[PDB]
Paper text:
The ring-like structural maintenance of chromosomes (SMC) complex [name] folds the genome of [name] and related bacteria into large loops, presumably by active DNA loop extrusion. [name] activity within the replication terminus macrodomain is suppressed by the sequence-specific unloader [name]. [name] is the SMC complex of E. coli and other enterobacteria. Its SMC subunit is [name], which associates with the kleisin [name] (Woo et al., 2009; Zawadzka et al., 2018).
Author numbering:
A (entry chain B): 248 to 297
B (entry chain E): 2 to 213
C (entry chain F): 9 to 80
D (entry chain I): 1 to 134
E (entry chain J): 1 to 135
F (entry chain B): 1138 to 1235
Write the structure that this text describes.
Amino acid sequence: AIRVTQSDRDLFKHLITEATSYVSADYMRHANERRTHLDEALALRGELFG
Amino acid sequence: SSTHIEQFMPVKLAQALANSLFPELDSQLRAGRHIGIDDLDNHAFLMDFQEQLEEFYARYNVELIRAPEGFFYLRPRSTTLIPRSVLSELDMMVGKILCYLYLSPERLANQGIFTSQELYEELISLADEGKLMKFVNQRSSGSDLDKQKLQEKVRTTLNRLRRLGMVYFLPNNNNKFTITEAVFRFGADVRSGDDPREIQLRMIRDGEAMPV
Amino acid sequence: FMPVKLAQALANSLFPELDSQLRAGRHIGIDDLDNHAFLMDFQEQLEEFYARYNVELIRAPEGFFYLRPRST
Amino acid sequence: MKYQQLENLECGWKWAYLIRKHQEGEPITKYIENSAAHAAVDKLIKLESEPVRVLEWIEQHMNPDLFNRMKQTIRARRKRHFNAEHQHTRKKSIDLDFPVWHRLSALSQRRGNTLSETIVQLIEDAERKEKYAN
Amino acid sequence: MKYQQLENLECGWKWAYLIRKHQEGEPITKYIENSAAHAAVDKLIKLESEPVRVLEWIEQHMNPDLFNRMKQTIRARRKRHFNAEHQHTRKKSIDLDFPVWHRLSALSQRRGNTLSETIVQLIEDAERKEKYANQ
Amino acid sequence: LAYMEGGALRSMSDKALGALRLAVADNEHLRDALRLSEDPKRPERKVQFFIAVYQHLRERIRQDIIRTDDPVDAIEQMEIELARLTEELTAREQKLAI
DNA sequence: ATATATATATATATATATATATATATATAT
DNA sequence: ATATATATATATATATATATATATATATAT
DNA sequence: TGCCGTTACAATGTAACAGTGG
DNA sequence: CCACTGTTACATTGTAACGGCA
């Protein structure tokens, strides 16, 4: 029972931590580049109008 | 490719059917034996390859069914390829009583080991002595000869249930036994808090219980 | 694993009825064309399958098949 | 009907396509149970070198939803096979940067022409402008 | 180096390339003996979930022919994967009839520019005509 | 992570995928979802796979008391159970010795 | 009340695989 | 020119798993 | 309608050229 | 020099959508 429960706990911990690490990194990236692209686009729009 | 097991049978089902435990378990199951937690090897075998065996046995028009209590068994359908049979009303009395003893704390000192005498005493305590005796013999009025006849009938029904796995005789004693969780099936008509007359129809529709 | 031809014989849709009738002791003769042909074809494997049950699948000189239980 | 259909060729095409799809994981057969699907796939695998029986195999075990895709794939294969004989009937494939393609497709949709017709007209106009200047 | 090299991605790409090549029937192995080639392929198959060891399997049993095609294919796959992020960096595939493509390629080779550049110049001349018509 | 730049995020995502490849080889559909999650044209796929991981660990719960279906919550209950089992193991080995 | 069927356990003999020790011919150190 | 070490073959006998037959308890049915 | 040609793509693989830095 | 990378111009196969025609 001890062996099984320890294996289950280790598997859960590793899976959860690695999935969060894999996903949140790219999510934050996409957010940062989205902000940057919006900032870039505003100036072009302003110049274009005049 | 040809000469390849997946052509005819799934790999896990074939592995299960080729295991050394399969034949004894299959013969017992077809005989009507219920499987409880006590038969650790057989119970684990059923758990591991549970799905393969339900689909295999479906070919016989019989459902391998695991009750919520955790005991597997076979329920034949109306189109069963394996014959079907129903327990006697006295068998129901003894099974309900056995479930009571499983759940009864007064007999906790027994630690699960019970003698047929105690079972009969409890049966007469909860049932109607003479009106239950009526079934043993139509002309009974409390005669002690008929009393012994009822005791013998109860013993015989207990032996049959032992054959069904609801009860185990002790490794050396056939006069003492230990109850198994399978007995819970005798309460399937009351496990749900609804009107008895609707639950009986539900069960009979499901094939769980025919009438008499 | 399992013998391949044994898996083929067991998987055949005729197997459930024939198995029930054999375990019921019924004797399969030449009259049952489909069952007799199936047993003829797959005897080499059904003998082992039913020997796993400590039973013998016997083809009589007349030809009919049956199951003979051992002591075990 | 413009291109004549040849059985020993289109049947080999169909066999290769189905084997490719099976190797790719596509469910070739209509049988959900794995045993029947595997048996049919083995029949197909050993069925190589046979048009008259691969056609029947298709009629009997083929997945219903792949019929249209297989039909159009064979159509395209036939057309390409017949067009690949002569240089002028062949087709040249190129990759265009997204802005250039966007503008070209805008023009093509606007004028109702195809990409080939639109580019031909534009090149002819460029030549005409050259001659105008020259 | 313009594109970041990711080891755990390029390794998976390489493994998929090897497996695809093998199942296509080509001799990825450098072994002429059937048994050693089969064993090496089986080990590669076992290496599915361990892309890191795939580089070593390459250095031990990869056919010497395939270095150039390998280094070409993974390079192109990297470029395409990084360009696919944004539309404006993507590529569009189109098919052209032989006469049309012949004329276009002759014109491009005349002007010494890529096909996209030639199309840009052409569409820009057409749009200049349209613009002066509009004004 | 907000401070860092794209390169480090990409590198650590690659490392996480490397860990996952080992952590997922056993499963078939979860592994397939992980593989599909690699397309750069459809970032949402990533999130879907994440859900699957949860949608996996939810079914790995053993019995009712550990049905804190939030996987991150079951860790504490499981650690409590491991500690408990340690005490019973000590008692049981003492009993076996005697 | 007793004949009879059924399940279980033990003793007994068969058949096969395998480790042990010895005999014989050849190889190689003395 | 010799004797010891090796490889080969063989019988011995050791152990296991199988299959058979008999005794027993005892639960059923007339 | 269903087949049949036809177009416009998508995905991947290669050869060839141009750059870049060790 | 040499190797490794970025890029273009293809090929190859598959697919969905139009439109013609019996």
